């Protein structure tokens, strides 16, 4: 199973389009699931994602208007439980009821969020953590020189291979990170 992970496009309010060099790489008929962190913009981008896969999961980020999209979810892909949330939630740890509800979100194999536009991908204590960054390199609060990125996960049995794609200078650069769940 191939899983596309992306978000934070902000089209067309901040960026008019995905970079050609990333969009080239995506075509119908290859990806089984999309996990989108939100901040797409207008419906056009959601429609585009729906050409690419039959199972599209998106969450609602800050200033996203379409309230039919859930704030957070937990999705099962193969043997993996994946949590998905935009990341602009401002809730303090001390509201114990809210904390109790977050347990379901932390008790997942792979955790994905967005919002910052800064990519990350690592293993910690048998769990894997991904922020795909922004696929358009849209600006965030502090910064303007955001490196466009997105993520593909190749999932098979108990092994996930995460590919991080980044647009640096002239070329797409790929890092390949292997994760096996014990
Ligand atoms: Mn954003
Ligand atoms: Mn955001």
Curated annotation (Swiss-Prot):
> Which GO biological process categories is it annotated with?
endocytic recycling; Golgi to vacuole transport; protein transport; retrograde transport, endosome to Golgi
Q: Which GO terms describe its molecular function?
A: metal ion binding
Keyword Chloroplast assigned to the entry: answer is no
Which InterPro entries does the UniProt entry name for this protein?
A: Calcineurin-like_PHP_lpxH (IPR024654), Metallo-depent_PP-like (IPR029052), Phosphodiesterase_MJ0936/Vps29 (IPR000979), Vps29 (IPR028661)
- PTM annotation (N6-acetyllysine): residues: 50
Localization (cell): Cytoplasm; Membrane; Endosome membrane
**A Pfam family assignment:** Metallophos_2
Q: What is its main location?
A: cytoplasm
Outcome of mutating residue 90 to D, per the record? Decreases interaction with VPS35
Q: Which UniProt keywords apply?
A: Acetylation, Cytoplasm, Endosome, Membrane, Metal-binding, Protein transport, Transport, Zinc
- SS bond partners: none
Quote the NCBIfam families the UniProt record gives. Answer: yfcE
Q: What does this protein do?
A: Component of the commander complex that is essential for endosomal recycling of transmembrane cargos; the commander complex is composed of the CCC subcomplex and the retriever subcomplex. Component of the retriever complex, which is a heterotrimeric complex related to retromer cargo-selective complex (CSC) and essential for retromer-independent retrieval and recycling of numerous cargos such as integrin alpha-5/beta-1 (ITGA5:ITGB1). Component of the retromer cargo-selective complex (CSC).
Assembly information from the UniProt record: Component of the commander complex consisting of the CCC subcomplex and the retriever subcomplex. Component of the heterotrimeric retriever complex formed by VPS26C, VPS29 and VPS35L; within the complex interacts with VPS35L. Component of the heterotrimeric retromer cargo-selective complex (CSC), also described as vacuolar protein sorting subcomplex (VPS) formed by VPS26 (VPS26A or VPS26B), VPS29 and VPS35. The CSC has a highly elongated structure with VPS26 and VPS29 binding independently at opposite distal ends of VPS35 as central platform.
**Entry's family note:** Belongs to the VPS29 family.
> What protein name does the entry list?
Vacuolar protein sorting-associated protein 29
- Species the sequence originates in: Mus musculus (Mouse)
